[PDB]
C-alpha cells in the first residue's frame, strides 16, 4: 500500500514501543501525571 516517511514511521514505532514495553518504576511514575484542575 502507501509508504510512510522514515522519521514519521520511527516516531510512531516509538509510540508503540512505549505503550508495549514493561516500564521500570522510575519511569512508570513519570507516566503517572496530575490533572487539569
Interaction pattern, residues 8-37, with another protein; x per rule: CB under 8 A: -xx-xxxxxx-xxxxxx-xx----------
For the CB of residue 22, give the shortest distance to another protein in the complex, in Å.
Answer: 5
Q: Give the CA angle between residues 23, 28, 31 to the nearest 5°.
A: 120
The correct pick among 2, 7, 35, 36 for binding RNA (CB under 7 A) is 7
Closest residue by Cα to residue 7 from 20, 15, 21: 15
- Whole-angstrom distance, CA of residue 3 vs CA of residue 31: 31
30 touches RNA (CB under 7 A): no
For the CB of residue 3, give the shortest distance to RNA in the complex, in Å.
Answer: 15
Amino acid at each position: 500500500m502507501v509508504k510512510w516517511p522514515e522519521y514519521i514511521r520511527l516516531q510512531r514505532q516509538k509510540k508503540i514501543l512505549r505503550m508495549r514495553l514493561k516500564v521500570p518504576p522510575a519511569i512508570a511514575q513519570f507516566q503517572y501525571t496530575l490533572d487539569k484542575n
